Design a protein around this ligand. Structure first.
Ligand code: NA
Ligand code: NA
Ligand code: NA
Ligand code: NA
Ligand code: NA
Length: 206
């Protein structure tokens, strides 16, 4: 990672995201279990965290951090691969290491290919990759569904990728409200947006 210029800046940005989301979730008894699980993930899967920062460093190298759209795209890449990594971590914790790699490799292929375009295109693809994994995680942690979803993103044009990201994001809001209640869900989503903004600003200053 150290010969991947940008890895330390990506880490600072991701840690800023994590700190802000942690504080938002930790402030509310309904959301604290999320903050605790997120700390456990980072503690237990340092190798996946570093792999996320490595892909972010590739995004920094290609897009720069000289403007808000590029910075947002790098953050979106990290958050999209993080969603993939949560399912990969489940697979690894359960001894299904090869399937975890297949999942990570396909997500990384799609994200890397998007880096040839504009930041706004990268952000759309990254959001779609994130939902491809998240939707499969909630539906029984199915690597088969995740791979199918990722292949559908791969074969989708930009508008179709955006539409899929929007459907998944809407389903995600619904899941948060169903699980934590609408009131706590709104607080969580606001903290998430603040964490994105924190990470964007760290990248811009890097
Ligand atoms: Na790099
Ligand atoms: Na505690
Ligand atoms: Na964990
Ligand atoms: Na996300
Ligand atoms: Na994303």
């Amino acid at each position: 990672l150290y010969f991947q210029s940008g890895g330390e800046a990506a880490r600072r940005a991701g840690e800023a995201f994590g700190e802000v989301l942690d504080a938002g979730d930790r402030a509310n008894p309904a959301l604290q279990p999320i903050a605790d699980e997120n700390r456990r993930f980072v503690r237990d899967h340092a190798d996946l965290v570093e792999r996320i920062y490595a892909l972010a460093a590739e995004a920094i190298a290609r897009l720069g951090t000289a403007d808000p759209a590029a910075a947002a795209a790098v953050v979106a890449v990290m958050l999209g691969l993080l969603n993939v990594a949560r399912l990969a971590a489940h697979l690894r914790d359960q001894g299904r290491d090869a399937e975890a790699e297949e999942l990570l490799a396909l997500a990384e292929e799609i994200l890397r290919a998007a880096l040839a375009g504009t930041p706004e295109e990268v952000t759309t693809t990254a959001r779609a990759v994130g939902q491809a994994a998240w939707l499969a995680f909630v539906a029984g942690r199915s690597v088969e569904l995740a791979l199918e979803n990722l292949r559908k993103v791969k074969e989708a044009n930009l508008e179709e990728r955006r539409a899929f990201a929007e459907e998944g994001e809407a389903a995600s809001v619904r899941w948060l409200a169903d699980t934590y209640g609408a009131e706590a869900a709104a607080a969580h989503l606001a903290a998430y947006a603040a964490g994105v903004a924190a990470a964007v600003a760290i990248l811009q200053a890097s």
